Structure 1
Amino acid sequence: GHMPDLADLFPGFGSEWINTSSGRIFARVGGDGPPLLLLHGFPQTHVMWHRVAPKLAERFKVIVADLPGYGWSDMPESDEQHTPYTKRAMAKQLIEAMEQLGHVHFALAGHDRGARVSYRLALDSPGRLSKLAVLDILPTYEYWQRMNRAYALKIYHWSFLAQPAPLPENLLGGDPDFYVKAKLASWTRAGDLSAFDPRAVEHYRIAFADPMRRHVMCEDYRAGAYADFEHDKIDVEAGNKIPVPMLALWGASGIAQSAATPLDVWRKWASDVQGAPIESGNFLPEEAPDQTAEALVRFFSA
């Protein structure tokens, strides 16, 4: 990396800044074997995979990428439809990045926003994927269809971060550290920062400290309220299901299971899906790294 103060949490992994038509994608790359792309979510960066990626690199060529606009990836300028931060566009961008590495058919695991990229990739371009894992999510459509008083109060940030700019940007800009740290803690099982490595927390904090990075996060959530929802609605209403073998993992105290039975939801969206809970909040790869690594290795190796 180019930031002198931040830890290297993937000892021995290389790196890559991969050009695409929407901007560079930063990734750490390690291991050997079949290619496996790992995609983080909010308010994190690729480093969230640091306690799973080395175990996966014993079996796979692991590509640990910052999402478009996140971490050290470039931040394309957005537009009125939030286009570069839609899951459709991110998926296209990451497909281009993987081609740069010679990977036209690969395995994919995503967490949170990255899981949203991942299932959208599978809907739009299933030929790209051998197998898919989604961690800690339901489809975006399913979150919004669950909207009611209880869900609006229990899971407020979808609507808040989606408000027109500059509302969330101004609110987040006064004390960004307090907001990101409280979010990271709130969504864990225990409600504190103990599940995270402090060095990883520093990566998350430093990213969140940049106004441009916060803007991207809000654009991601705007897309999540608008285009992403629309795209998902088209698929569900058409009865399109992902044909790619799929794994759904979620924390037992996470967001996805708030008011759903996640495997039943996924079966509506995918024709060959398996899945299981793990005792954890919303940050499976950090909260439950050994169980998450095992479940992924077993799924992708089968």
Structure 2
Amino acid sequence: AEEFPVPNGFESAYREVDGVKLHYVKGGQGPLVMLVHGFGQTWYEWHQLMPELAKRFTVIAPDLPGLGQSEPPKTGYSGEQVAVYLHKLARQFSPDRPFDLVAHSIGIWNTYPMVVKNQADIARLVYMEAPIPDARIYRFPAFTAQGESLVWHFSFFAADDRLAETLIAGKERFFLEHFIKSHASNTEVFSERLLDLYARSYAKPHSLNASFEYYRALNESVRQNAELAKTRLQMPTMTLAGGGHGGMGTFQLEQMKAYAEDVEGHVLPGCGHWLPEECAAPMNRLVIDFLSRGRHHH
């Protein structure tokens, strides 16, 4: 059985990486593009982009360790630790040439270290909708004049005593609907059915815990990145962010300018945090065009 429907022409499969069984969905032909999902979701957030991208590239979309159908990490949930798994997975499929990387939400946290440490392995980079973990995250407000702030969940999820697991267990669907809609401009794109699918996946006990362990390691990731960022990124990079309610707006590109020498950014009006679903068509177009400036299958 599969947690999410696999697009025609794609395969659902697994690979062991450093003793951890990673799930991914793969299809297409040509140079490799790895798509990395974020919190509250799985490989499936990429299911609309995948068929289009697969016309020109080999596309792989893994589940992050502990989430979807991937085994939890055996090392830890810090960015540097998780990035090893994703880098080695990509290298299994693209040993002889650099690959492209697209990441959303905590997919950014879990890839930045392997990007900065293995720059020759990364042809082009697309990051969307989340800060790279650094001191900037300590500036986001706890509360706003309009109500709940964007990232108070960083504290909720990082809290000890299994605070988040304990409160959310038995209420996973309820919580995820609130969380998704509070970070969305276009809530309509999230059908009750789609919410059901995502909720059932992250409700698996080890996945509910894994979700929050990423946040429990966030300060460690910030400290790791303080050292890593001494080396700027040199590959062509694009950032995307939502310009509507729930989105990062200008923050995404502005932060990335501090990390990357060669970066272009777009803010998508009318879209929030969940770009692949809220603004599928324009997001897909921007990603496909940016990656197609490089070598690919015709």
Q: Distance in 2 between matches of 1:170 and 1:26?
A: 27
Q: CA deviation at 1:165?
A: 3.6
- Partner of 2:99 in structure 1? 106
Cα pair 2:13 2:24 within 8 Å, conserved: yes
Q: CA deviation at 1:277?
A: 0.7
Q: How does 1:44-83 map to 2 (within 5 A)?
A: 44-77=41-74, 83=75
Match of 2:237 among 237, 240, 246: 246
Match of 1:157 among 146, 153, 160: 153
Find out whether 1:229 has 2:229 as its counterpart.
Answer: no
Match of 1:273 among 263, 279, 288: 263
Q: Match of 2:10, as an amino acid?
A: F
Q: Match of 2:41, as an amino acid?
A: Q
Q: Any unmatched runs of 5+ in structure 2?
A: 294-298
Q: Secondary structure at the match of 1:250?
A: strand
Q: Secondary structure at the match of 2:13?
A: strand
Q: Distance in 1 between matches of 2:92 and 2:200?
A: 28
Cα pair 1:180 1:208 within 8 Å, conserved: no
Q: What TM-score comes out, normalization by structure 2 length? A: 0.89
Q: Distance in 2 between matches of 1:251 and 1:295?
A: 13
Q: What TM-score comes out, normalization by structure 1 length? A: 0.88
Q: Match of 1:91, as an amino acid?
A: A
- Partner of 1:80 in structure 2? none
Q: Distance in 2 between matches of 1:264 and 1:95?
A: 26
Match of 1:285 among 271, 276, 285: 276
Match of 2:174 among 164, 178, 181: 178
Q: Distance in 2 between matches of 1:210 and 1:261?
A: 33
- Partner of 1:212 in structure 2? 206
Q: Distance in 2 between matches of 1:221 and 1:254?
A: 23
Deviations 1:30-73 (A, max 9, x none): 11111100000010000011111111111111101111111001
- Partner of 2:133 in structure 1? 140
Q: How many residues of Structure 1 are paired with residues of Structure 2 in the alignment?
A: 288
State the identity as a percent: 26
Q: Any unmatched runs of 5+ in structure 1?
A: 78-82
Quick one: structure 1 residues 186 and 153, their matched pair in 2 at CA, closer, same or farther if it must change by over 3 Å?
closer
Q: Match of 1:177, as an amino acid?
A: R
Q: Distance in 2 between matches of 1:25 and 1:128?
A: 20
Q: CA deviation at 1:253?
A: 2.5
Cα pair 2:134 2:226 within 8 Å, conserved: yes
Q: Match of 1:28, as an amino acid?
A: V
After the TM superposition, which of the residue ranges 58-67 and 203-212 deviates more from structure 2? Answer: 203-212
After the TM superposition, which of the residue ranges 215-224 and 110-119 deviates more from structure 2? Answer: 110-119
Q: Match of 1:46, as an amino acid?
A: W
- Partner of 2:296 in structure 1? none
Q: CA deviation at 1:22?
A: 4.2
Quick one: structure 1 residues 257 and 76, their matched pair in 2 at CA, closer, same or farther if it must change by over 3 Å?
closer
